[PDB]
Structure 1
Amino acid sequence: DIVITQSPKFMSTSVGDRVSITCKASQDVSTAVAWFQQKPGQSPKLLIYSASYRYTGVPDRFTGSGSGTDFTFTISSVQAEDLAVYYCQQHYSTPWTFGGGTKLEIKRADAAPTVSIFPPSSEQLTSGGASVVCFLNNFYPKDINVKWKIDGSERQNGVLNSWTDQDSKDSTYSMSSTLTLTKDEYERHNSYTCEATHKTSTSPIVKSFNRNE
């Protein structure tokens, strides 16, 4: 089994910059290497074949080079749409193995999140559940903190967070925080707060409600 090591695993680059991915083979695979681009929710897309040959329709900013054991893939000037995971592959000897991928992230200006809290709906209460959903939309960078100060006391149980894939247009991340608990647990307290601690502001963005307003 010919092992392929792709480097780096992750990459952050601004629109207009140049980026190079390297692909190393455990043994000589001549020029039988292909490069694939896969955007979220889509099948892989062939960009470069035969190490250095551009596939039909692919832009001139994408290039590949190499022979034997060392292979390179280059984007001369990155576009906002180039956000994807990039794979190399050897096809010199079976089984035809892929690299581990390189996830390409886009650098943009720092963005403060639009925060919004949501009380459990009457229809969920009916079922015996109580989920408090806090949305944190369109921010940069991805690194963000959420604290749940229920009546001044912190809560770490039932809190589930989920980041969106980076936006292909404006390069931003969105993140949901959900505090799930039982109906009667929701009924025992009153003030529910989700606070967003982010590097763009020392004073965290607060959003709160009371059970009956």
Structure 2
Amino acid sequence: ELVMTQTPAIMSASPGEKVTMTCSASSSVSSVHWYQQKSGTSPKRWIYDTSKLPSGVPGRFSGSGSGTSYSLTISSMEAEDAATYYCQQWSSNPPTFGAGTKLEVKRADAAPTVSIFPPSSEQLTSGGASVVCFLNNFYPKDINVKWKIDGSERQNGVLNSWTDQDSKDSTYSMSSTLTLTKDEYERHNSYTCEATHKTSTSPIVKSFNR
């Protein structure tokens, strides 16, 4: 149960930048381990026994520390270093892990490609009706979506999901699903997906008429 606080919780860097993250323990620990984890894959030891590099780990990585204050440093950031880093201590059982530092890689801004989709026939047949909207490959990761049916905003029945930074183009994506009963759907004509992003003052809109 000893607690490792990792800082910052989230951070971004352009390739080439020096990167530093800290691991501060609530109690004395004699050492720590660092793990790198990229979206969709298992954790992997990146630094062991606080200053040591396992084979295959790039030398731009280094770790140092003592007592209750540890840190991991990247001399020169590369796009392939984007991932979440966890520190772990094994001085006491349980060998507690930190909550992690999510290192993201920055790139040029990019507006989202927005696509809307009416409910399918198979679903309508089941008494259900979902309208789907995709906001793909945008950057920064901050974005909003708003549903409008015949002009007025709709808030209930909306489920949103966000992907982690893309590994090839470093963009983010979002999916918004609006579900209504089949009869509520057929009581209206215009369905709109509105996306507000940094790359544009006025929101992007896509829509269809029933």
The TM-score range, normalised by the shorter chain, is: over 0.9
Deviation at 1:96, TM superposition (A): 1.2
Amino acid at match of 2:206: K
Q: Supply the distance in 2 between the matched residues of 1:95 and 1:88 (Cα, whole angstroms).
A: 14
Is 1:56 the counterpart of 2:51 in the alignment?
A: no
Residue number in structure 1 paired with 2:4: 4
Task: Return the alpha-carbon distance in structure 2 between the equivalents of residues 143 and 136 of structure 1.
Answer: 12
Aligned to 2:18: 18
Q: d(CA) in 1 for partners of 2:170 and 2:69?
A: 32
Q: Is the 1:38–1:45 Cα contact (8 Å) retained in structure 2?
A: yes
Which ranges of structure 2 fall in alignment gaps of 5 or more residues? none
Name 1:36's counterpart in structure 2: 35
Alignment match, 1:163: 162
Q: Which amino acid aligns with 2:176?
A: S
Alpha-carbon shift at residue 38 of structure 1 (Å):
1.0
Alignment partner of 1:185: what SS? helix
SS of 1:100's equivalent?
coil
Aligned partner letter, 2:60: R
The answer as to whether partners of 1:14 and 1:108 remain within 8 angstroms in 2 is yes
Which of 16-25 and 45-54 deviates more?
Answer: 16-25
Alpha carbons of structure 1 residues 116 and 98: separation in structure 2 relative to 1, 3 Å: same
2:89 is aligned with 1:70: no
1:85 and 1:71 map into 2 onto residues whose CA distance is 16
Taking the aligned partners of 1:195 and 1:78, their CA distance within structure 2 comes to: 35
Shift, 1:208, TM fit: 0.8
TM-score of the two chains, using structure 2 as the length reference: 0.95
Unaligned runs of 5+ residues in structure 1 are none
Counterparts of 1:189 and 1:27, CA distance in 2: 61
RMSD over aligned Cα atoms: 1.2
Cα distance in 2 for residues equivalent to 1:159 and 1:67: 48
Question: How many residues align structurally?
Answer: 210
The 5 Å alignment of 1:3-152 reads 3-30=3-30, 32-152=31-151
Q: C-alpha offsets along residues 98-154 of structure 1, whole Å, 9 cap, x if unaligned?
A: 112111122111110000110111111111110000111000111111111211111
3-state secondary structure, aligned to 1:42: coil
Can you list the C-alpha shifts for 1:4-59, whole angstroms capped at 9, x where unaligned?
A: 222121112112211111112233323x2110011122211001111101011111
Contact 1:15 1:106 in 2 (8 A): yes
Give the TM-score normalised by structure 1.
0.94
- The share of aligned pairs that are identical, in percent, is 79
What's the secondary structure of 2:186's corresponding residue? helix
